[PDB]
Amino acid sequence: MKELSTIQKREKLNTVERIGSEGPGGAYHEYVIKSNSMDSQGNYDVYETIKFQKGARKEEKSQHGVIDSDLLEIVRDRLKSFQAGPFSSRENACALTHVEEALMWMNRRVEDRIERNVLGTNTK
Amino acid sequence: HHHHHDPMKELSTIQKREKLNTVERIGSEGPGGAYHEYVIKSNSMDSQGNYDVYETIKFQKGARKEEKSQHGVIDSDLLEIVRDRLKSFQAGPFSSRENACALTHVEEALMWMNRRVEDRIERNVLGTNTK
Ligand SMILES: Nc1ncnc2c1ncn2[C@@H]1O[C@@H]2COP(=O)(O)OP(=O)(O)OC[C@H]3O[C@@H](O[C@H]2[C@H]1O)[C@H](O)[C@@H]3O
Ligand SMILES: Nc1ncnc2c1ncn2[C@@H]1O[C@@H]2COP(=O)(O)OP(=O)(O)OC[C@H]3O[C@@H](O[C@H]2[C@H]1O)[C@H](O)[C@@H]3O
């Protein structure tokens, strides 16, 4: 089925769903973030769709969208702000270090593909 | 729908070369000292000057047990999406060690985020303006 099995199991604010089918690289390129709560009339309090860059950027027929490092950079910024604020935590600091190292590995991939001159194409 | 182009508002990213998108924080600091609206916008624009990509991410603003709260996305949602995409890419033809390391770190970040949630349930402070 469609809903993601999440690491968080208790008191989840939102459900996340993959929409559509597998595409380039074997990945999905549309996701829905959905409130677990509803308003008085049965509507979701939150219903957001995230659409990924589908097909590499230099190939024809490719569809523009967000990329995964965008999401990680937003979360990185949020954790940095929370850590500079009144409600910091050790858990935040550990999560932030892992988020930044993930981003560093994603950039490692980007720079390797620039070097092998395959960035933006469907090549190993 | 939005025409092209503070750099104080744009996020300084880990990636420096061949960025697809610019990420910008919208608005002011809010609860916890954090921003709760971000825009992801393509570095390319069409023939008429409009962004090819212009998407807004709005976060749950104000803790869930407090008044005034505005419903929205939470950070672990974004990370679970990235986790799923990395898992898919790793099961596909274009796997990599870089993907594997990024995936392990993303999942451990999510594990610390859930660790925080469970610690806050234990202290009975989840959803409140409490350290
Ligand atoms: N961690 C990964 N992130 C992205 N893509 C990955 C990863 N691991 C493997 N891939 C695959 O290599 C191709 C070229 O990617 P790329 O050259 O890095 O980048 P891009 O130009 O930014 O396009 C990005 C889009 O490309 C399409 O193909 C991708 C995937 O099939 C996809 O639909 C992307 O959403
Ligand atoms: N890693 C963090 N994630 C979220 N929030 C964090 C973190 N680190 C510190 N905070 C701060 O503690 C408060 C209580 O958060 P919580 O009990 O986890 O909140 P919640 O019910 O899930 O609501 C969530 C919203 O709450 C508001 O305040 C938050 C923040 O000021 C914010 O606008 C949130 O976007």
UniProtKB/Swiss-Prot annotation, chain A:
Keyword set, alphabetical order: Nucleotide-binding
Coiled coil, from the record: none
Binding site for 2'cADPR: 29, 53, 55, 57, 78, 82, 87, 92, 109, 113, 120, 122
GO molecular function, a single term: nucleotide binding
InterPro entries per record: Acb2/Tad1_hairpin
Superkingdom as given in the UniProt entry: Bacteria
Record's miscellaneous remark: Although 2'cADPR has been crystallized with Tad1 (represented here), evidence suggests 3'cADPR is produced by ThsB2 (AC J8CSK2) and 3'cADPR activates ThsA better than 2'cADPR (AC J8G6Z1).
Role summary: Blocks activity of the Thoeris antiviral defense system (ThsA and ThsB). Binds 2 molecules of 2'cADPR (2' cyclic ADP-D-ribose) per dimer, sequestering them from ThsA; sequestration prevents the signal (probably 3'cADPR in vivo rather than 2'cADPR) from activating the Thoeris antiviral defense system.
Family affiliation: Belongs to the Tad1 family.
Description of its domains: Upon ligand binding the C-terminus changes conformation, enclosing the ligand.
Name of the molecule in the record: Thoeris anti-defense 1
Organism: Clostridium botulinum
Lineage: Bacteria, Bacillati, Bacillota, Clostridia, Eubacteriales
Curated annotation (Swiss-Prot), chain B:
Other observations noted: Although 2'cADPR has been crystallized with Tad1 (represented here), evidence suggests 3'cADPR is produced by ThsB2 (AC J8CSK2) and 3'cADPR activates ThsA better than 2'cADPR (AC J8G6Z1). Encoded in a prophage region of this genome.
Record's comment describing the protein's domains: Upon ligand binding the C-terminus changes conformation, enclosing the ligand.
Record's subunit section: Homodimer, the subunits are arranged head-to-tail.
Organism (species): Clostridium botulinum
Annotated positions binding 2'cADPR: 36, 60, 62, 64, 85, 89, 94, 99, 116, 120, 127, 129
Entry protein name: Thoeris anti-defense 1
InterPro entries per record: Acb2/Tad1_hairpin (IPR056098)
Superkingdom assignment: Bacteria
